[PDB]
Symmetry: C2
Subunit: 213 residues, 2 copies
């Protein structure tokens, strides 16, 4: 059983991933994904979630008082608090494997200017906190990153949801002047394995030379 709680000011962003979960998995108690509007924990008639940064500069910083109350309600001692941010440790396939065996993920989606740092510092005194970046680019908010993390983690949970892969082919054998490589039709399975290893080597050199050293 995995429980995922997402806290966002855009709860509608998450609805399609919730609906996509198979009934079988949910009915088997394998997974539960809940989405919470952060404004439920606001203090004021204006439902304020952010405020001007100390030390000045542009942008707004999300309020520690609101986030503090939300995580007090949603988190437990067992929780892994995930905070998507461009300033985070890299989220990789290794992370997704590690997190696929967690009982309770809480994903705190903020604006890219960020959540007051005391929220993560306070939470780390009573649970595990992971600030993570999904890649080498800035997003306006954590919601699109939350969708990537949920998908990367849940596809590794049974029943729920090195070199580059080389090119793939299916019927027909000739299409707009382009033939499927005839080795693939040869029935020499050792030779096909060697051909695919060479295609993966060439592709990795071209696209991701960092992966070879």
């Amino acid at each position: 059983s995995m429980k995922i709680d997402v806290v966002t000011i855009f709860p509608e962003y998450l609805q399609p991933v919730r609906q996509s979960l198979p009934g079988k998995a949910i009915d088997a108690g394998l997974v539960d994904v809940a989405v919470h509007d952060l404004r439920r924990w606001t203090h004021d008639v204006h439902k304020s979630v952010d405020d001007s940064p100390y030390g000045g500069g542009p942008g707004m910083v999300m309020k520690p008082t609101v986030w503090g109350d939300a995580l007090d309600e949603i988190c437990t001692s067992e929780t892994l608090l995930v905070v998507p941010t461009p300033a985070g440790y890299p989220f990789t396939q290794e992370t997704a494997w590690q997190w696929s065996t967690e009982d309770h993920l809480v994903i705190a989606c903020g604006r890219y200017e960020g959540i007051d740092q005391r929220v993560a510092d306070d939470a780390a005194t009573r649970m595990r906190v992971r600030e993570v970046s999904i890649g080498d680019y800035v997003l306006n908010g954590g919601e699109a990153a939350a969708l990537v993390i949920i998908e990367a983690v849940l596809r590794l949970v049974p029943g729920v949801l090195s070199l580059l892969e080389g090119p793939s082919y299916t019927r027909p054998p000739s299409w707009r002047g382009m033939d499927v490589p005839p080795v693939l039709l040869s029935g020499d399975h050792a030779k096909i394995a060697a051909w695919r290893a060479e295609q993966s080597r060439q592709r990795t050199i071209e696209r991701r030379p960092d992966l070879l050293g």
Copy 2:
């Protein structure tokens, strides 16, 4: 303005594009985002988009005929065709800046084991084609990658408008016995700039030592 066409067998997965800054860019007429069901280009009862691979292997490959016909209708010679795949070139901030100036992006999202290589190779005879990875992890399909690419690009388009950002703070100045760093309360612009620069470099070397030319953990 900019046109974005997304082609998917799960058009419902793209609805989040109507939220947050992409939603605001759409409402303000700076971008038009159209989402198309690939199954619109099938001609059979079962509306089949996949078949077993040549050469063997697990799973299914998306058929070239259906993609060919979709991209013939949606794409022109001016189109940048974006194919999200874990086997792609890295998508980075520099890519987002470059694509922010494009008139027409088409995002072809494939699930299963991927799309026939001949779809990208054929499109590349007529238009610019970019196979891109948004990061070193595997997804079930290109739809979540498409939302990441759209968000990363649209926040840069004129009309909306290295090192890690260090920590940020707002009121109150003391919370649960935790104080905002005194320099940020001091009103000294040069000490604040100095402390923010140091915090950025210290976070970068802890979290992303690769950005400063050091070995990853």
